[PDB]
Amino acid sequence: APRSVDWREKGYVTPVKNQGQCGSCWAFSATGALEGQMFRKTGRLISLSEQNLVDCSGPQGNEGCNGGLMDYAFQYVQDNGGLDSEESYPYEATEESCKYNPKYSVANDTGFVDIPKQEKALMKAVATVGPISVAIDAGHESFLFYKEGIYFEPDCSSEDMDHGVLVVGYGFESSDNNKYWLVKNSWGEEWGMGGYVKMAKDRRNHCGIASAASYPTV
Ligand SMILES: *[C@H](N)c1nc(N2CCOCC2)nc(N(Cc2ccc(Cl)cc2)C2CCCCC2)n1
């Protein structure tokens, strides 16, 4: 359980992406985790198709630009036996008809692991496994206009999450509660710290970050 962790440094994270005006954070989150877990199994980092997820994973109970869960996406790739590359199946930001092509598949998974609902367990996973899909409470002006430092919103909810993101590490600064999660959001590089956000860690599961954490098995 190193005191600090950043999976970017290890070649597990792709660049920050833009979801645009569409309810598909859950897709970006899930390709984030799959990107890293594939990169652990194979050492090739390949960007994956959110459009594929948005378009094709209705049967798993996702709902395109109207929402879905990372767990349904991980299911979809198991159910479907593959997921296409970003290059082969580019992000359109609407919801179209399934064009999944099995010949351009680059990732597959054998299920997913739901993390216990605690920050200690999250931290283990982030340190042992790689980047983790999580859901957070992002329904606040403060998040929307975030810019730097350690995000703390007194109004944030431990259990009512409305946005999926990726945890790519954690660290601490240099008075009292100094610790944070390194979180990769999908709103383009403009937003906050290069598209990233240093969420408050170990302050009572702030924004519910530890509350629906998972990753795929590959
Ligand atoms: C992520 N972009 C997102 N968007 C939305 N909505 C935006 C469009 O208007 C409806 C809601 N909702 C979620 N969301 C809640 C949810 C909706 C539908 C389903 Cl099948 C599952 C969840 C997610 C909750 C789980 C963590 C990610 C956010 N997300």
Side-chain angles (χ1 to χ4, degrees), residues 100-142:
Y100 169 77
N101 198 330
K103 289 204 96 233
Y104 299 141
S105 185
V106 278
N108 335 84
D109 80 28
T110 51
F112 60 91
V113 166
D114 267 311
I115 305 196
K117 280 211 260 293
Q118 299 94 41
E119 294 197 80
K120 271 346 155 205
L122 188 44
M123 185 174 69
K124 270 167 171 156
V126 174
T128 83
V129 170
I132 310 291
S133 308
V134 300
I136 52 163
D137 189 13
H140 298 97
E141 287 310 357
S142 46

Side-chain angles (χ1 to χ4, degrees), residues 49-57 76 80 82-84 89 100:
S49 178
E50 304 78 25
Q51 200 61 49
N52 193 160
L53 298 182
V54 157
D55 280 351
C56 304
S57 69
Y76 167 79
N80 182 56
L83 175 64
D84 281 341
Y89 200 157
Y100 169 77

Side-chain angles (χ1 to χ4, degrees), residues 129-185:
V129 170
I132 310 291
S133 308
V134 300
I136 52 163
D137 189 13
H140 298 97
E141 287 310 357
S142 46
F143 192 85
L144 191 19
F145 298 126
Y146 168 72
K147 257 298 210 280
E148 67 219 74
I150 289 194
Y151 177 87
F152 196 80
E153 177 47 85
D155 197 49
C156 241
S157 178
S158 250
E159 320 104 44
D160 276 355
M161 295 81 73
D162 52 6
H163 195 55
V165 295
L166 195 72
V167 180
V168 304
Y170 57 86
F172 57 91
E173 309 233 46
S174 303
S175 315
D176 333 289
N177 32 226
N178 44 356
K179 312 186 273 149
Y180 61 91
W181 299 109
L182 191 61
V183 175
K184 188 208 213 199
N185 183 36

Side-chain angles (χ1 to χ4, degrees), residues 19 22-26 61 63 65-69 72 135 161-164:
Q19 56 182 95
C22 147
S24 66
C25 51
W26 56 270
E63 259 153 343
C65 290
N66 282 121
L69 306 166
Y72 297 161
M161 295 81 73
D162 52 6
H163 195 55

